[model samples]
Target chain A: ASTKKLSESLKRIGDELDSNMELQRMDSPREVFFRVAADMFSDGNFNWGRVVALFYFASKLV
Target chain B: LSESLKRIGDELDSNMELQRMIAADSPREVFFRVAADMFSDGNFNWGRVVALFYFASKLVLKA
Candidate 1:
């Protein structure tokens, strides 16, 4: 139910990152994780899109 | 590390489906259940407990 929704969101955001040349070429997974996490939460709100982005990006790290 | 924590971690490692399932659940309550499960054995390690609380605190600030 909710999982499907999250999975789809992650897929969409993950692809968006994949296509972004700057993010795709990033060297360090740890750095990417922290940066994205910070960026996503920068607005002082928990963004599900960015949270999924972090999850997808971190998964790609491994 | 306790056996329950290791077991839960290992199971979640390969099971993406389970990961989604747990994540879709009430995260706050799910966290509570996990913390209880980890200490269910009655053996409390300072390291594990502190780490759990540390992460929980971070979530609390965000949530």
Candidate 2:
């Protein structure tokens, strides 16, 4: 259930970032973008925080 | 050829939706629902399902 674990992690991250002014200010497509980022991060061995930071940066580019 | 192409397009649509759902904080029930639908419709493609889960896991871990 690595997928399940990863999904849960992303959901947690999404919930956390959803409240941030920077993320909220961007007004990016939250659901889809987060979903994409989450899926990318669900690999079970990576540093989750780094993944979050990457997505945060990428979200700015979008 | 056109009919086959149409079928392929439909499959692709299903795959996209499944992938999106898997990535979108979908619950286990949702995955089961999609699987059930595919089974009932005689369109079950385990490969796509597995791929969806695999990509979802990768995304979650990488993010």
Candidate 3:
């Protein structure tokens, strides 16, 4: 189901963030992020770019 | 590393309404907190809402 996938993906992202992923706090996503969600929504990288962007903002909250 | 989660936790700790909402794990609370504020897009920010879910779930404050 869509809800399950979302929860699973979010849990996986949370897992990665808890593990080796270097989630550094940045003043802007530009500090470490390259791909934009606009691009993610269009071609290639899918929601990965959106996920990365979310992580950038989330890292600051850490 | 930042204390973002802790700061959010503190808010939940202090605010009864927030604590109740998060304690119940209501989806609208995420919306209320994320979008009802000055910077949000008029009580509607799905992106921030998802992020807040992780925080709310991970750091659930005992009410």
Pick by DockQ: which candidate is best?
A: 3
Return the interface RMSD of model 3. Answer: 12.9
Ranking by lDDT: 1, 2, 3
Task: Write model 1 residue lDDT over B1-63, tens digit each, in one string.
Answer: 122223222332334553344344256865665565545555453334433443344346556
Off by over 4 Å in 3: A25-55, A58-62, B1-63
Residue A35 of model 1, lDDT score: 61
In Å, residue B25's CA in model 2 sits off its true spot by 4.7
TM-score for candidate 3, residues paired by index: 0.24
lDDT of 2 by residue, A26-55 (tens): 344556555555654455434433343443
Tens-digit lDDT track for model 3 on B1-63?
223323322332344443343343455454344333423233323334434454444344332
Q: Candidate 1 clash total?
A: 0
lDDT of 3 by residue, A1-62 (tens): 42333333334334443443343333455533333334334444332224434454545445
The regions of model 2 sitting more than 4 angstroms off are A1-62, B1-21, B43-46, B55-63
Q: Model 1, residue A1: displacement in angstroms?
A: 19
What DockQ does candidate 1 score? 0.03
Quality of model 3 by C-alpha lDDT: 0.38
**Cα interface RMSD of each candidate:** 15.4, 16.4, 12.9
RMSD of each: 14.3, 17.1, 14.4
Q: What DockQ does candidate 3 have relative to the true complex?
A: 0.04
True contacts kept of each: 0.00, 0.00, 0.01
TM-score of chain B of each: 0.49, 0.33, 0.29
